[PDB]
């Protein structure tokens, strides 16, 4: 029963920061940036992830900055942050103490995948549904994730809530201005990316997006490959070859243009005959190759295949209520307010005033 | 555009006969019947199968690749030009028409080698053992050998990885395969980044240069002694910023300049100042200090900064190979490894002087 007290800052809020004391360390994984730990607060118990990564003492941290002004329900909590010292030299760590949530998207997935079955379409709306409200939300202050993945799709089982997590390739994209190539992870890179474009935008985390629905769908990636090369003969595969315009839009730059002419491949004939039609509408809407032709994240969460979590009646196979899916905020909905009248039902949210 | 003849020798054994054209000699068609077709591979491509030549009882390799009527292939066509003990040989190639359509196949007849490099070392992880370094040295040597020879062409593989390294285990023989993303590179001319497999990606592929060298092959190569050596894949990483990371453990921090060499255009210079970490630390112990100073010579950021095939060749990691009683574990003579050409010198002849050793030289 090793206690292990603190003075961490809040994570949001005025930086005043307190004593907090937490016990029951134990490690939860690793990062080539740093340790995850899981450990129990001593006042509430509740269970919480510690995220430690070795801070340079002359820059701040991008990921903190970018958590400290995120509040959402599908994105995973900045409680505290506090800073440690490293043994091994004056080496100092920052370390970020998140929500603790069960589960990703990728293990439970891989479930389904290893038993042979199919992740019920019900979770596939659900998952979905709560990663495009992220993505909308962060995306509104020109925040890009760009390493859209079922890695860093957290979730809570029980509950059915999904939390976005790991911003430490997030970035403020400012037109105009360059970025590196280089992030997000194979699978699910956006072709510009895999082309080398340093002028993409937030639209990356859509196609991403676009592969992770497609993958929950199919049982295992789309779009694999060792190489670039050959994660675009997939995806040219799916998609056939892409025009001189499209390749244009994506990026005007990258000499080679020897690529078989594959004629667009049927997006019906991609999934098993069972797979519902507005899951393939919804798929081709994302993963489109002009970047500026993807739909944008809230305008997914107000597609048909979403139509199912709208519904009064719907409840989760547990018999327990759907999470939250209809508290929009203004900041959330300002890239296009009129959708409102899709995204919140009629029976959500109604209270009076007493 | 061609055809095939299939029919039933015997036992109701089909054979399919074929003519095709000599891979390096003249055009002089020839008639080829093979037999027990199965495929032994599969890529975005096509399929290469396995085959018996009817009368030799030979096996040989079929790649199977869509033929695009629009250019020529440029796979064949620098396969054509290329004759070298440690590169698969082009027995012939025949055009066959594929039932599907309008589309043609292009059919390339290869010698049949029955591992990979992939497939040994895979083994050895597996029961947790390492391949005995003799055997590091004999694949690596020859490596560098056959990468020396395509490189005196200007041609660059580009796609360097230990499933492209076809082995016989008995002679230890090593042979470059798939020149499918092989290239001439010209000096002013651009070519696009996103060939090579992860984990064995050169930093400048990474950082997205499009005038890089054929030295990103001898990254490549580097990565592949190192894995052999360590028993898992040195720079392993989902991500191009994971795997620049792993990179950035071992050699440390990339200076300025050294980005400038890789890459005078990309932006993110935002990355943890790590220190150089000790080449002998990253592997176990024991580990022949020689073949970590090759290591390190290879995986450098500065492109023109990396030993050449030749010098790889002749660096001190292989010197038990030019020891004139150096025999296989198994009793059995190494393969040939001092017979150079010319043309494989070409790129530094007074190296011969290291290369071939005095015993290779005797008259008798
Ligand atoms: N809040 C959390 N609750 C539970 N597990 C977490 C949490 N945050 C991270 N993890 C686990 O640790 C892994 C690494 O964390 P991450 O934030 O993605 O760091 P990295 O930069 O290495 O990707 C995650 O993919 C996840 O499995
Ligand atoms: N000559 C050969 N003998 C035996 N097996 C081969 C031969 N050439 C290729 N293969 C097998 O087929 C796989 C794919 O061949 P390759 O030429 O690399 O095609 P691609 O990479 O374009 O799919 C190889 O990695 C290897 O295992
Ligand atoms: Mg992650
Ligand atoms: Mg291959």
Not at 77 to 85: E, T
Request: some cysteine; hydrophobic content about 35%; glycine content about 4%.
């Amino acid at each position: 029963s090793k206690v292990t007290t603190v003075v961490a800052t809040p994570g949001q809020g005025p930086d005043r920061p307190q004593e907090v004391s937490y016990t029951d360390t134990k490690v939860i994984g690793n990062g080539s940036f740093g340790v995850v730990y899981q450990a129990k607060l001593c006042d509430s118990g509740e269970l919480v992830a510690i995220k430690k990564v070795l801070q340079d003492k002359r820059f701040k941290n991008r990921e903190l900055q970018i958590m400290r002004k995120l509040d959402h329900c599908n994105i995973v909590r900045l409680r505290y942050f506090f800073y440690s010292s490293g043994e091994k030299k004056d080496e100092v760590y920052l370390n970020l103490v998140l929500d603790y949530v069960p589960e990703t998207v990728y293990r439970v997935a891989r479930h389904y995948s290893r038993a042979k079955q199919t992740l019920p379409v019900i979770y596939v709306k659900l998952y979905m549904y709560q990663l495009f409200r992220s993505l909308a939300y962060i995306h509104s202050f020109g925040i890009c994730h760009r390493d859209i993945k079922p890695q860093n799709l957290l979730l809570d089982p029980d509950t059915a809530v999904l939390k976005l997590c790991d911003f430490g390739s997030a970035k403020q994209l400012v037109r105009g201005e360059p970025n590196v190539s280089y992030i997000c992870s194979r699978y699910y890179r956006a072709p510009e990316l895999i082309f080398g474009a340093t002028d993409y935008t937030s639209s990356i985390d859509v196609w991403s997006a676009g592969c992770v629905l497609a993958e929950l769908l199919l049982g295992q990636p789309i779009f694999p490959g060792d190489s670039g090369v050959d994660q675009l003969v997939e995806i040219i595969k799916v998609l056939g070859t892409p025009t001189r315009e499209q390749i244009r839009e994506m990026n005007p730059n990258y000499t080679e243009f020897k690529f078989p002419q594959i004629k667009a491949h049927p997006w019906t004939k991609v999934f098993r005959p069972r797979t519902p039609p507005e899951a393939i509408a919804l798929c081709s809407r994302l993963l489109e190759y002009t970047p500026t032709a993807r739909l944008t994240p809230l305008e997914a969460c107000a597609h048909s295949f979403f139509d199912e979590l709208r519904d009064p009646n719907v409840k989760l196979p547990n018999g327990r209520d759907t999470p939250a899916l209809f508290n929009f905020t203004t900041q959330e909905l300002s890239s296009n307010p009129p959708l409102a009248t899709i995204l919140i039902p009629p029976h959500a949210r109604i209270q009076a005033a007493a």
